[PDB]
Design a protein around this ligand. Structure first.
Ligand SMILES: NC(=O)[C@H]1CCCN(C(=O)Cc2cncnc2Cl)C1
Ligand SMILES: [Zn+2]
Length: 138
């Protein structure tokens, strides 16, 4: 679990969005595993606008933050789950690191701000949904 709170927006993994997120929907994209909903309160976070390929992410299954080197956002094949059929997920960045299903939503940050959130994993890999291209979040 986990979300980004920026301005009057809440960014979550689309597969973990609540009834309230869908009732206050701003934008969603199944191909990216992202959903953005509106909030009444002003958010705590700031978004990176950069091309960093190193950062630190929060791993809830270890209660720890880990440093990572990650690939540029790209189209990556993701196997079927209870939430999606087998498909290509776009704007996804991979890194070597630990992840379990409940780890989705953990923030990845660089020196400039929030880069993205955990969205995939397995076998010593972790995948992050990039949010740096969503300029309208600001
Ligand atoms: N973005 C998706 O399609 C995810 C939907 C939830 C299920 N997905 C996973 O990768 C679950 C997972 C498994 N093992 C280790 N880390 C993780 Cl995060 C895929
Ligand atoms: Zn950066």
């Amino acid at each position: 679990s986990g979300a980004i709170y920026v301005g009057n927006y809440r960014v979550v993994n689309r597969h973990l969005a609540t009834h309230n997120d869908w009732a206050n929907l701003v934008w969603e994209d199944s191909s990216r595993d992202l959903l953005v909903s509106s909030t009444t309160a002003q958010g705590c976070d700031t978004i990176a606008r950069c091309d960093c390929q190193t950062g630190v992410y929060y791993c809830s299954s270890r209660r720890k933050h880990y440093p990572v080197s990650f690939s540029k956002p790209s189209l990556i094949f993701v196997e079927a789950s209870e939430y999606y059929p087998a498909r290509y997920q776009s704007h996804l960045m991979l890194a070597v690191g630990h992840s379990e299903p409940g780890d989705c939503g953990g923030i990845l940050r660089c020196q400039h701000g929030v880069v993205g959130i955990v969205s995939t994993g397995g076998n010593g890999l972790v995948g992050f949904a990039d949010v740096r291209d969503l300029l309208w979040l600001d």
